[PDB]
Amino acid sequence: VQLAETGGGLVEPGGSLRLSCAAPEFRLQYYTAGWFRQAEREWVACISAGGGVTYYTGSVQGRFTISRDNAKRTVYLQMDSLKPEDTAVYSCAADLEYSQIMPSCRGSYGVRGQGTQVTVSSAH
């Protein structure tokens, strides 16, 4: 675990939340970054090193947005219109397999963060 995630927690259905993933030592700015979730683990979104190309899994298309700030060596997941089914542990990773982003976020994504719980519920 070479990445440091932050920003999860409880959110009302229909609400928004923003996750952050920062790199203390790792040069994140050079690599494709992606977010994954597990309620089996599945890819959610990925973004090219330069930030000009992104891919999203079908179930989050139009609701989630991935972005990055290379000057801060950080990657973000903006989650809008959240649903109960979005409840899961979310984790960021960087891919060192490919020099460019691959369609459907193909890659080994061998460097990762610890992950954060995101819970979508009206409770509390």
Partner: protein
């Protein structure tokens, strides 16, 4: 006519960029037109023109420090390097190789030939550490580049210089020589890890010359005498035929001409 230059940077290195780098090195080392038992041979030194004798590997890191290694095409091994306006060569084993290296880095205003050779036995002694004690990976390579650079300004001592050579030679020369070693480097890059080479890597390195001879002198791929290698856990096993080495070895040193093939 300049020697061919291949560039690699540790800054943002990926499995893909490293793969392209090693494939380019192999492509400049040999044409691949000479193949024995499905394994390519490096150029025969006999009659090899001086302007085709070397290739250059330019390495840089995030700090924008750069060094250039010179590799001998006849064995894929590092013979010297340049950093800024200084160049350093391992001790040549004979008069003809001493003459050959005078053709390298010819503009440098500071030119040095080390009294010592560049074989691992010597480098390990100078480093005060064995290959099995020295981590390999993108990080170690980045650090080796810096150390090679700072030697020219007195910022690096000999033991660290030797350690840095051990790192560069394995991640470039040995990786070029062995598909298997390239693969071990790929794994390190994939997970951004650094670790010393296991016994299988070290013994392959030690055996490269002997394997080249065994394969080229074989009777239809069958070895005259067995060669002992090591598994990843250190256990020893014997190889009796070229077959199992085909996925392992990428390049061989030229040992002899192949047996004459019949026209029938």
């Amino acid at each position: 006519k300049q020697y061919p230059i291949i560039n690699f940077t540790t800054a943002g290195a990926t499995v893909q960029s490293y793969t392209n780098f090693i494939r380019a090195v192999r492509g400049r080392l040999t044409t691949g037109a000479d193949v024995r038992h499905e394994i390519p041979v490096l150029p025969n030194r006999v009659g090899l023109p001086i302007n085709q004798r070397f290739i250059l590997v330019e390495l840089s890191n995030h700090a924008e420090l750069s060094v250039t290694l010179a590799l001998d095409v006849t064995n894929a091994y590092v013979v010297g390097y340049r950093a800024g306006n200084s160049a350093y060569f391992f001790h040549p084993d004979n008069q003809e190789d001493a003459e050959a290296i005078t053709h390298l880095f010819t503009d440098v205003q500071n030119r040095y030939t080390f009294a010592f050779g560049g074989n691992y036995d010597r480098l390990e002694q100078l480093a005060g550490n064995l290959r099995e004690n020295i981590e390999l990976g993108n990080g170690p390579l980045e650090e080796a580049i810096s150390a090679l650079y700072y030697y020219s300004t007195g910022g690096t001592q000999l033991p660290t210089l030797a350690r840095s050579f051990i790192i560069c030679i394995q991640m470039i020369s040995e990786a070029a020589r062995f598909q298997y070693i390239e693969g071990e480097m790929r794994t390190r890059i994939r997970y951004n890890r650094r670790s010393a080479p296991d016994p299988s890597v070290i013994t392959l390195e030690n055996s490269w010359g002997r394997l080249s001879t065994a394969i080229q002198e074989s009777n239809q791929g069958a070895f005259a005498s067995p060669i002992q290698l090591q598994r990843r856990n250190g256990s020893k096993f014997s190889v009796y035929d070229v077959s199992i080495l085909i996925p392992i070895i990428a390049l061989m040193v030229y040992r002899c001409a192949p047996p004459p093939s019949s026209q029938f």
